[PDB]
Amino acid sequence: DSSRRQYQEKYKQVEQYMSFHKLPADFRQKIHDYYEHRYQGKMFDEDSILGELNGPLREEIVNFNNRKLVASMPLFANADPNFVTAMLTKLKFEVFQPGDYIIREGTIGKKMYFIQHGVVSVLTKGNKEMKLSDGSYFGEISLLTRGRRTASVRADTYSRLYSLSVDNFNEVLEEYPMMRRAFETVAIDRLDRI
Amino acid sequence: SSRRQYQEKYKQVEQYMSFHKLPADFRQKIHDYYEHRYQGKMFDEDSILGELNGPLREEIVNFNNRKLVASMPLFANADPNFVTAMLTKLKFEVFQPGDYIIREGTIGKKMYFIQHGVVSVLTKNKEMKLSDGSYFGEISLLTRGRRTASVRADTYSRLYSLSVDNFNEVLEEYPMMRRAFETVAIDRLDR
Amino acid sequence: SSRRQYQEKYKQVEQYMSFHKLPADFRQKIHDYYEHRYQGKMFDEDSILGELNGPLREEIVNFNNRKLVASMPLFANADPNFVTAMLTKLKFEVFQPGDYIIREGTIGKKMYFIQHGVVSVLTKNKEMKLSDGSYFGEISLLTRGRRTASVRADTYSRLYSLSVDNFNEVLEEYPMMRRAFETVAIDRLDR
Amino acid sequence: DSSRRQYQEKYKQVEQYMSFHKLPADFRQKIHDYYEHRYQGKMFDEDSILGELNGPLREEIVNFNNRKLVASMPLFANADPNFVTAMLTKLKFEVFQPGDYIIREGTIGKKMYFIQHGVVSVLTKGNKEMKLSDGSYFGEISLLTRGRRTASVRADTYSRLYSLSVDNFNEVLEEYPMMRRAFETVAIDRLDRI
Amino acid sequence: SSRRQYQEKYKQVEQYMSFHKLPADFRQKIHDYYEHRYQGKMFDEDSILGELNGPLREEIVNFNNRKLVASMPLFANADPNFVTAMLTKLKFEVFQPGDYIIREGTIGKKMYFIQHGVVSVLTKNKEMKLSDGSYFGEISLLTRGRRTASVRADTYSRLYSLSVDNFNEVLEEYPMMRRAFETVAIDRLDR
Amino acid sequence: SSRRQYQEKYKQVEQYMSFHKLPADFRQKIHDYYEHRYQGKMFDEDSILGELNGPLREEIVNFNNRKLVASMPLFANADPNFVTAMLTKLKFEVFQPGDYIIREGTIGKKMYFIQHGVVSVLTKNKEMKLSDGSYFGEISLLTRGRRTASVRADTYSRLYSLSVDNFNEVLEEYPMMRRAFETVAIDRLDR
Amino acid sequence: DSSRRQYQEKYKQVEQYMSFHKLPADFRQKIHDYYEHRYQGKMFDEDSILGELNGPLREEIVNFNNRKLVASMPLFANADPNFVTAMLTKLKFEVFQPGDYIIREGTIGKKMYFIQHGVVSVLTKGNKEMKLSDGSYFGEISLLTRGRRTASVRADTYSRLYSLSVDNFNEVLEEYPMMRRAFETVAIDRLDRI
Amino acid sequence: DSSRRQYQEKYKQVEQYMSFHKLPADFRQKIHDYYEHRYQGKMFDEDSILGELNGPLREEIVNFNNRKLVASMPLFANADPNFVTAMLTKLKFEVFQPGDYIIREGTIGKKMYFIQHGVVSVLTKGNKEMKLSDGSYFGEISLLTRGRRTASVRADTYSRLYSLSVDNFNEVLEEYPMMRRAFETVAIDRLDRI
Ligand SMILES: Nc1ncnc2c1ncn2[C@@H]1O[C@@H]2COP(=O)(O)O[C@H]2[C@H]1O
Ligand SMILES: Nc1ncnc2c1ncn2[C@@H]1O[C@@H]2COP(=O)(O)O[C@H]2[C@H]1O
Ligand SMILES: Nc1ncnc2c1ncn2[C@@H]1O[C@@H]2COP(=O)(O)O[C@H]2[C@H]1O
Ligand SMILES: Nc1ncnc2c1ncn2[C@@H]1O[C@@H]2COP(=O)(O)O[C@H]2[C@H]1O
Ligand SMILES: Nc1ncnc2c1ncn2[C@@H]1O[C@@H]2COP(=O)(O)O[C@H]2[C@H]1O
Ligand SMILES: Nc1ncnc2c1ncn2[C@@H]1O[C@@H]2COP(=O)(O)O[C@H]2[C@H]1O
């Protein structure tokens, strides 16, 4: 494929970067593993392709790609499908590796995360650790309160996540103000536990 | 002396109404309002409270509004610091029977807590009544949309109003308390 | 007593004019203005209306301005809530013969509704007269451009002014009412 | 042509995207049809080409390309030609397919649309449906009032549209404030009907 | 005469407390506050200082606060223009024993300089006392974070408060003086 | 009666100075200021001018400031509408010998026009004197930089001040008048 | 050269654009002439090249390229050379063709222009026309006053100009506030004439 | 390498630029020397590569690349490692040549600089000159005070620097407000000396 070729060419550049900066062998291996998991040996100009489409098609694509995730989350499954679409269109796919701190306690929070596939651990001084998996979200509390992160969140497995920025969160909720309650209920219940 | 202050202030009202040649029934309506709102006594509340400190102002506003606070779970079951923050922002208002407190379709700049009285919520279908210990006008404040209904006083109504700016300021400090308002709004929108 | 309030307030004016050694003709001009503007009676209108509630303030402003409202299709044929929103924002002003109410080329911060009087619109060619039931100063408010003409009082003129900020605020609530002003502005610009 | 080649290369990437995400056959067909209608088998870097020009030439091009559309609309035909130019320069070409919801009732409106070629249906709860075609525009009401969309608008045919953002609408009308009346008159007449 | 002004102002307080039916102990608490805060004399300080010029206002605020200034290195060892800028912004406040001047976890809008009195800093562990010549409430102003502790008056306490906006304004002119506050904040956060 | 108003206002000053135990020499300094600033007469100028209309306020401010206007080409040779815009924004201030009107290195928030008096411009070298018909403090307003010099009153000095916000507002309407200030600033910076 | 090749490849794209939009023969000729004058048969990624440099080198380059223009203008020749550098760094090269309206009277003005090489005519209702040439600038008045353009300015010859945006004009003058007087003196003298 | 090739291709473009603008021989030599020092004969799309990664990996890379610099500066060595990471992620690598004015006295300051490797001279009217080298920073004072530059700073050797913008400086210190004191202490001590 032209896409397998693009991936190979891009990763060759990554190897040249890593050698230029004399990254240790095991570090280069970690980066290689990331690239394989994130891109699965194929690359295309996604922003370019999607930008060449129109609104309806982009919305149809994002709804199709996220079918299963949507159905597994009462947040979305039960919602106005236009709210679901507005949310989906703002999501950014990210992949984390085992051990990664996705969120660090006490920092400024600018994103939340929806778990497509993976296991993460929520870590608080007053433990023990609490796990979240497919169909859950986290990082909402800072977005709601503008306070610092209430816990750290560490990937236990390779985790395929979708992030939503605080600005995009606030934009969607300007259009669908009553959907704020869904996030607040989860946040309140979590704050009560910790 | 606050009786004298009232009588002096009302004499100025009378001279205004005379200058502008308001008809007798209207002047009587204004007289009745003044009696219900001020109860024959007036003082410069702003200057008085401004002479005090934060703790005393807060103690006073809590004492004055004990019934309001105990009347709604919103306040009764909340962080007392949230309650105090809200109370300090409330403005007392009296409405007369027939008054349109809120008009459907307009921009919403305030919500209202009912201390005593009965109002009718009017939508284009039967009127829905609200009374002591309820609030209304919250939906515009939450959504920034236009008023979803008219609200008309059925009886003399003693209300406390809260401006949209003050609502947002308090909820900046107490963000999770937004949920209490949203629950009421969602239930009402469904209905 | 509002007669006494007037006479006391005017005595303070007299002491100001004396301190600053204004010439006799100028002092007479100020005296005549005071008589026309206040008609021998004064009261703290702001404090009075501030003691009332929204409904009564709105009832009063509508009653006081019945003639103005009926005099122009702008108000006469509009949503009465738009009319009330506009009226609440109006400031009463009296001008004397020869007064330049608006100067060509300056920044426009207000428009004016004529309750009673005659003004001349002056462009660099014959003067165009406007009288009871007309308005002017709208073009700057619409365009943010400089004044297209001077406007000078021919007679004692009783006007209501509306600030650019208030104009924009009302039209935020009533966006389609902008068209009424634009139609007048376009016709005048063509002429 | 170098432009036919560019289109072919770009569409190959689109096929690789669609296969990667396992899009259904009929969905891939819909996307293929869109690409053919939107680009007509040719691609170039339009933003790059136009960006290499100067102001006068860009304005001459946009006026030429839109000759017929302009003449068919009393909005433009009767206007200051500098207003026409200012408007034209802000327009974004979009193509919609039969059945597409271009506008959904009740949502936040951030664009209006001018119809170059196509038929659309305006749909309100209090129907019946009203059709608009070449030389008409829609979506103006939200732009004027900042209220939510008063109706849905669905493409009945392949529709070649030019969108104008609310920011660009407001910018042009800052320069030509009296032209706001043209949009208001249409909006008022439509609000009276619905 | 300022004794007469005090007695008149306090009579208005009494009429307020009577209207709102405050209990006797509360009325006594308010009486005691008034005596400590105003010491039997009242004047319109704002109007008085507003009648003066900048130099005289600055001379007065420096003279009135000599003890405060000499009591802390922050002021004692600083650019006298910084000291004057700060002093002009301070608001005098009196608190009574038991008053929560600052509540932990709330939004911080002010800091406080102790002229005379003792307060307890309370954290969830033994109380830490602060007295004449110390300040508190600085940490929220620096960080924009919530209050790290409660601060409660142990004695009648005569404080000067400085708003967050005024704090930031002064430090815009005197940016390096931020370090003095930061040093105190860091030491306290470590503890 | 404005003599009575002065004497009443000054009695309140005396009670303030007594409460705060200002020393005799300082009280005398304040007394002398009051006499020079108000000349034994006081009235509520703000309320008085607020009772008038735009034309009369403008006529009054022009009449009161004829000498200032004729004394500087800045005003004397300018669009009279610019002159009026500036005058309406000026605040009268009196300074005493030795007063530091401007301190070098501080943030500049005002400039000053000399009606009557002598000031010294002080730079770290010989003092440069300015008198009737000159202005100073313009450089900070133009550049947003810190004050380039100190300016100290040598005699009792009757000045009009213009705030940086008001300066910028007027120059928004009259942009080419900025050049008059810049020419003075450039000449002074060179020197 | 790689630069002659890049130009040829880019212009081929321009021809494909022009044929796609069926531009008239004489219009295509005008565009061809523009490209030859503007780029002189060579193209490179200038923003990329300059972006690869540092501050000092960019400043040395801009000062060198504009040596002659600077010396011919008392505005710059007499100024703080750091002011000259700050101004030069914000300038955008543009080329106009004979007959082009560079500025139209009555419009909102967002740029001024410095003439490197060319002749333009300033046109006012109260004429006659006034010519400006190498080393002059125009369009300053709107930038100073925020008023509408006081005249039209039309290129009489091929004109090689440098534009300066109102934002960039205001930025430079924040750093060098006393240099505002130079522009004001020219503006005042011109307003007096017209 | 693909990276050596990219560098060669890019530098060929630079030569074509320099010849087009007829830059003097010694000037072209200075630019050549800069390119060799800055890029060391290799080029890749660094922003592209780093943008393809996730947060954790970018942070691991920046921490690794800057190991030695961090350890040599009590500012960082002693700090919350999350503060160090936040700072590092905002830094921009720049290379200056002997004689370059990195900062000019009296100008508006929008950046500060950390010295990775090089010697610079701080120059004040009230001299003499003061040198700073590896592990030092400069330009902090304008960032703290918003005043004009208090001195000029000139590179004595080839200097490998990391710049931090005023906006990025203020952003990091919003998250770590007490770290402002470290910069203030250095600034105060320097202002006392000059
Ligand atoms: N008890 C809990 N159970 C599950 N998740 C939690 C719990 N407490 C906190 N979290 C999550 O951890 C996140 C840390 O970042 P935030 O505080 O922004 O949002 C927090 C929640 O999403
Ligand atoms: N079904 C309902 N029952 C009670 N109150 C309502 C109902 N619907 C609307 N309201 C109230 O009427 C108010 C009208 O103004 P708001 O839309 O701001 O907020 C609305 C609610 O507070
Ligand atoms: N031909 C005209 N007839 C009546 N009034 C006019 C005419 N031209 C201008 N005006 C008014 O004069 C006003 C001067 O200020 P404005 O430009 O703000 O608004 C202008 C109009 O209201
Ligand atoms: N009666 C009507 N006839 C034609 N178009 C309409 C009518 N009513 C609404 N529309 C259009 O449908 C659009 C829906 O989005 P807007 O409300 O922004 O703008 C609306 C109008 O452009
Ligand atoms: N260990 C301490 N010793 C003295 N004062 C403290 C200590 N910890 C906190 N404080 C003060 O208590 C204040 C509570 O409000 P702030 O967090 O704004 O600022 C805090 C400090 O001024
Ligand atoms: N050489 C000079 N002659 C007269 N006045 C000066 C001179 N230098 C500075 N000033 C004035 O002193 C003022 C001090 O404050 P500013 O810098 O704002 O503006 C300055 C000028 O108005």
Ligand SMILES: Nc1ncnc2c1ncn2[C@@H]1O[C@@H]2COP(=O)(O)O[C@H]2[C@H]1O
């Ligand atoms: N008399 C004149 N001589 C030369 N140039 C002029 C004259 N009048 C106007 N201009 C220029 O024409 C420009 C038109 O746009 P601006 O008004 O922004 O700025 C104007 C001046 O630069």
Ligand SMILES: Nc1ncnc2c1ncn2[C@@H]1O[C@@H]2COP(=O)(O)O[C@H]2[C@H]1O
């Ligand atoms: N005495 C000094 N020793 C070392 N560096 C200095 C000294 N004085 C000034 N500098 C640096 O030179 C910089 C010039 O720009 P800034 O004023 O922004 O910040 C200044 C300091 O970082």
